[PDB]
Write an enzyme that holds these catalytic residues in place. Structure first.
Site: not given
Length: 181
Positions: A41, A72, A146, A148
């Site tokens: 992402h 991911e 914040g 990730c």
């Protein structure tokens, strides 16, 4: 404060950079040579900022499993003038559950941040922001925006990178040795 924090600090002090894309600032784990990882992402493009320096992306691969399901993790090769310490021998070979993990973050918003998250479950499937995702680890800590790209470690192992949460639980994408052969 203890040997878990010791292992986490050793990884943070040598094997992380601050990565900035158009989607934000992320903790980024360097694994070996000029190869790092970031949550998919983050939407890595042709150019990324690494510790506030404009850096060409030589390659970026959003990993999927052999069910063609999102994992991911994006593996990024950076046009950087310096190699990372090789930490591939700290990566697990298989999917597993863990005791007594630490989540460690280093950005402008959260410098030198370490969180003891406790027990980590091999959760497996997660609808992550509407995207079916596999190989998800879960911990019962209220993680926030914040965090990730934060690194999840146990003593001896680098096991995942933080990719989301639901307000009560936090979720990490597994790191496996086989991703970095």
């Amino acid at each position: 404060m203890g040997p878990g924090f010791d292992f986490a600090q050793a990884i943070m002090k040598k094997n992380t950079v601050i990565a900035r894309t158009e989607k934000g600032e992320f903790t980024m784990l360097g694994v070996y040579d000029r190869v790092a990882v970031i949550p998919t992402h983050a939407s890595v493009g042709e150019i990324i900022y690494i510790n506030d320096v404009e850096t060409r992306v030589l390659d970026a691969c959003a990993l999927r499993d052999l069910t063609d399901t999102n994992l991911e993790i994006t593996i990024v090769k950076l046009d950087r003038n310096q190699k990372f310490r090789d930490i591939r021998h700290f990566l697990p070979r298989c999917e597993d559950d863990y005791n007594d993990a630490v989540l460690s973050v280093h950005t402008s918003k959260f410098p030198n941040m370490y969180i003891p998250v406790g027990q980590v479950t091999n959760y497996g499937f997660l609808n992550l922001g509407g995207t079916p995702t596999h190989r998800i680890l879960m911990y019962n800590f209220p993680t926030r925006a914040g965090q990730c790209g934060g690194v999840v470690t146990t003593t001896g192992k680098v096991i995942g990178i933080h990719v989301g949460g639901n307000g009560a639980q936090g979720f990490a994408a597994m790191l496996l040795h086989s991703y970095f052969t």
